[PDB]
């Protein structure tokens, strides 16, 4: 059974970890979260990377990128500064995969929360500026988080074939 290698970047803070323990755990409160799924009734391997990754010094961490399939390229809608910082995670993500078409999906995570900052709208003009798709997730409630991760994988498979 194929294995997808996904990376979630952006910035600290915004629940990159907490996705990655709602989808294997399935709850909210070393190097790798594995988790057999079904998507488009096929069996795969999730392999998502430790986000710690993103602390690395700055070979490594590039490393640590080129290593991944697909990436969610996540902020939180109540964090003007880590949607601003999705250009430049999206620019590091092409420089490092030598690509301007990687497999990528845009997450806007915490929309259980009143403070929203971040538009639904601003944040669909730039998915569509980009040409992939957007989900609004909570890892709290849990709202997106599956439909996240497999979009992303939706998204590689297209992106082989
Ligand atoms: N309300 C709410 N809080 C969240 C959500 N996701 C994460 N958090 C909280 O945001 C903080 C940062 O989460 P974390 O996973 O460490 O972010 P990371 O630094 O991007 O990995 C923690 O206090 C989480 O409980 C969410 O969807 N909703």
């Known amino acids: 059974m194929t294995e997808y290698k996904l990376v ?7 629940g990159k970890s907490a996705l990655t323990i ?3 755990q399935n709850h909210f409160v070393e190097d790798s979260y594995r988790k057999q799924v079904v998507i488009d009734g096929e069996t795969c391997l999730l392999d ?3 986000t710690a990754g993103q602390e690395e010094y700055s070979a490594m961490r590039d490393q640590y990128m ?3 399939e697909g990436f ?4 939180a ?3 003007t500064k880590s949607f601003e910082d999705i250009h430049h995670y ?3 993500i092409k420089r490092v995969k030598d690509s301007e078409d990687v497999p990528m999906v845009l997450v806007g995570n915490k929309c259980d929360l009143p403070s929203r900052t971040v538009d639904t709208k601003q944040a669909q003009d730039l998915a569509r500026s980009y040409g992939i798709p957007f989900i609004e997730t909570s890892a709290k409630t849990r709202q997106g988080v599956d439909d996240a991760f ?11 074939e």
């Not at 497999?150 to 082989?160: A, G």
């Open 66 to 68: 080129r290593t991944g």
């Open 90 to 92: 999206r620019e590091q």
């Open 72 to 75: 969610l390229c996540v902020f």
């Open 8 to 14: 979630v970047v952006g910035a600290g803070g915004i």
């Open 48 to 50: 998502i990377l430790d």
């Open 150 to 160: 497999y979009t992303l994988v939706r998204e590689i498979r297209k992106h082989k």
């Open 22 to 24: 709602q989808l294997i």
């Open 77 to 79: 809608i109540n964090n």
